[PDB]
A paper describes a structure:
FapC is the main fibre-forming component, with FapB and FapE present in the fibres as minor subunits. [name] is the membrane protein pore component through which the FapB, FapC and FapE substrates are secreted. Therefore, to provide insight into mechanistic basis of Fap secretion, we solved the crystal structure of the transmembrane domain (TD) of the transporter [name] (FapF83–406), termed [name]β from hereon. The TD of [name] comprises a 12-stranded plugged β-barrel ([name]β), which forms a tightly packed trimer within the crystal.
We also mutated the conserved double-phenylalanine residues (102FF103) that stabilise the position of the plug within the barrel. Interestingly, [name] [name] was fully functional, secreting FapC in an amyloid-competent form, whereas mutating the neighbouring F102 to alanine could not rescue amyloid secretion in the Δ[name] background. The critical F102 is packed within residue side chains in the barrel wall, anchoring the helix within the pore and defining the conformation of the hairpin within the barrel. In contrast, the dispensable F103 makes cation-π contacts with the residue R157. Furthermore, unbiased molecular simulations of the F102A/[name] double mutant showed that the whole plug is more mobile, and in particular a helix begins to move out from the barrel in one of the three subunits within the simulation timescale of 100 ns, leading to an opening of the channel. Both mutations were introduced into [name]β and purified as for the wild type. Suitable yields for crystallisation were not obtained for [name] F102A; however, a crystal structure was determined for [name] [name] mutant in which the same overall plug placement was observed within the pore as seen in the wild type.
Numbering used by the authors:
A (entry chain A): 88 to 122, 143 to 182, 192 to 243, 252 to 406
B (entry chain B): 88 to 122, 141 to 181, 192 to 406
C (entry chain C): 88 to 122, 143 to 183, 192 to 245, 253 to 406
The structure:
């Protein structure tokens, strides 16, 4: 099977099939904005290991490193806060390919992914103007099952995916933004679901190009301060649309370059995200 | 023959030169986010029911009924929401005439007009009810479903093949008719009758498309609609225009056409809003069944 | 050959091979809808002359003509409009040199310089009245020099391309650097410098037509003022980030004439919401 074809499937399905072991290195820049104003610049380095078994099972571990740099403007006045390279919410996932593509069926793949609360929690960080530090994960355990369907209708390859996320309830020693007090509390982050569709083409032996779209929807998040009852956090629910354009480029027989632009379609998504990924196959 | 070519043309022109009678079902989602009041989020679902009759690749007649479902959140801090369970929208109908057949030097041209009737729930006389939590947060008592008036919209389409790429374009404009109402205030304490005149508007856009294979097509296109501002005239006052009622709504579109079985087509389309007067995005799926 | 390939290269690289003299007329419409709401509609007619010397050197001069309409609404609602009838902008000119020719392993490489004179109406003199300006500028008021670089390369049927440049602005000075009607302050200005890059991909659809997808960013550093008083100062929100996503075509109308439609979608708040353009290079 051509090289371009193998890589279109790997990018689309999340399943690195032709091969056994792989280490992926990702670099990603994203950019946010607002009215006061508020610029932000996020760099993330992804490190990923993957073990693929017979092209039927797959296991992966993932470690993000996060450098961040924000600006809060309000007055005449402008002020920065930043965050030198730290982890990261660490996560692993398992995947099973249950249908292999035939003339009637597609390539179907079910998966699970568990994310641990290893980064710097937002809750308990203190403060017009301005935070003491920037977080690097959400502070909670989460578990996300999902599904990928992929199929070739020569020369198109259509693909899609759906997934939902459950966050587990968790408690914090401090829950207050106010520098003076220290209140502790429980948190139920709202569940969420995600989906996307797209089309791709093998342009030649080594290159492929992809168009796609996805939307993420985040249910409302509730809080329990010590003493009081439950209550929902206003403005906490979200809708983050993305339109994506992408390529795939075979460098060696084992190296691939994967560039991707992702244009935020709503306010809840960053303005744009350029990304760059380098899977290596031993 | 075609049949991706044929599907592609029906989409680009708005003219099913193919068969005779057909019936299109459409579902469409659209997200809004805006910014007294601080932000207003909105989820809009629409089911379209459309019947059309094509005649000899020369005339076409069409009827459309939208069913509308909307949900809207009003933030100030605190927050409240409001709904509209499936009611009908502005029913409308359309005539079109193919005045140029495509050739080695001329395109497919199609002149047409579309008339729209105020069957939906209008926005005039819907009251702002202050809650009940934020104390200077005003929230509408119900949500509208059409714009309360009649309108006529003539328009034109041009389509030409330059193998393998099919260019296309279109222009139209909407004249709205003046109407009167028992109540046009949104104050719960007062009732003020009046007449209203919505701003007329014009739309245009261009695109390209391709037959990827015997059964699929893909397209890219762009558009802009521009709207003159609207006016109200209480009794017995004079016409006053309303600031911010003017608009410019630009859209960028990716779409496909997929032939499921000769009778059925599936037509997915993403429209990305480029301006604040357009919704942020709009997915849609349409299912023309050909009898 | 083909013409589709040639037109496509001229568009990615900014460098017309395959001709001697040429004249380009371009028309651009841009839409701003910002934050108080400053809504604005700009058109620009661009007139450009071009001389390529043996597919090696090239000299261009460009004259922009600029029409504007802005509209400001109350806040600290009622609208008020301002406009600026056709008026010459920031005349510029550039030289270019192709240092690598495309082979089985080499890209097509062009190095270049663009010099921009301050021939348009400067922003600094202009006065606020009431809270709205009594006119609109047509350029930025300073000299600037801009070296650039570009690469293009076929990997059949894909043509990959990319480019990068920076702009250095030259410190200047003005009789009036204020906008308060009741005050006339002299001073000296350093417009912040900037770094532009973008990348992209393009395909020949047939012997006449090409299609293009690309993206680019512009990063601008902060501007500074020195009043007569008086030492240097940062203007607080003068820095910028303007990102863009582009879809385009080239159509071969005839042997001499290409039509170039381009849509550019603003992705950040420091960019027009959108921009349409048509260009008509004519090759004598
Ligand atoms: C009209 C713009 C050209 C300005 C640069 C001067 C070019 C002189 O080149 C001489 C080349 O011919 C040598 C034979
Ligand atoms: C918007 C499309 C994004 C994908 C294209 C990225 C291309 C990398 C780079 C210069 O090319 C010639 C080098 O040889
Ligand atoms: C970034 C917004 C959320 C995108 C949602 C995409 C669905 C995730 C499905 C998991 C399967 C893996 N893969 C690569 C197809 O995404
Ligand atoms: C795509 C789904 C958009 C979510 C809007 C909520 C409406 N819904 C499905 C609950 O009825
Ligand atoms: C489609 C967006 C362009 C607006 C013009 C509509 C004319 N049309 C397609 C009905 O003929
Ligand atoms: C931003 C564009 C950089 C200037 C030089 C390259 N280009 C494509 C215009 O020729
Ligand atoms: C400012 C430069 C403008 C270009 C000058 C106009 C030249 C007119 C000649 C038109 C050519 C017609 N033709 C090819 C049939 O000869």
């Amino acid at each position: 099977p051509a090289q371009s074809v193998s890589n279109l499937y790997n990018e689309a399905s999340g399943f690195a099939g032709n091969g056994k072991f792989s280490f992926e290195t990702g670099i990603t820049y994203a950019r946010y904005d607002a009215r006061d104003r508020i610029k932000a610049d996020n760099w993330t380095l992804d490190l990923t290991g993957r073990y693929n078994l017979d092209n039927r099972w797959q296991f992966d571990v993932n470690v993000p490193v996060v450098y961040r740099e924000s600006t809060y403007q309000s007055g005449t006045s402008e002020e920065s806060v930043s965050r030198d390279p730290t982890i990261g919410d660490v996560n692993f996932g398992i995947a099973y390919k249950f249908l292999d593509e035939s003339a009637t069926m597609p390539d179907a793949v079910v998966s699970v992914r568990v994310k641990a609360p290893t980064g710097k929690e937002p809750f308990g960080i203190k403060l017009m103007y301005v935070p003491e530090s920037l977080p690097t994960g959400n502070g909670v355990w989460s578990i996300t099952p999902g599904l990928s369907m992929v199929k070739t209708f020569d020369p198109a390859v259509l693909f899609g995916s759906v997934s939902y996320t459950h966050n587990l309830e968790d408690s914090f020693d401090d829950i207050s933004s106010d520098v003076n007090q220290k209140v502790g509390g429980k948190v139920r982050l709202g569940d969420s679901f995600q989906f996307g569709v797209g089309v791709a083409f093998a342009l030649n032996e080594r290159m492929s190009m992809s168009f796609s779209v996805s939307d993420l929807i985040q249910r409302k998040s509730k809080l329990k301060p010590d003493g009081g009852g439950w209550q929902s956090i206003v403005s906490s629910d979200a809708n983050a649309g993305y339109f994506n354009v992408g390529m795939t480029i075979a460098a060696s027989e084992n190296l691939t370059i994967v560039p991707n632009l992702a244009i935020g379609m709503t306010d809840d998504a960053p303005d744009f995200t350029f990304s760059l990924k380098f899977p290596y196959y031993f």
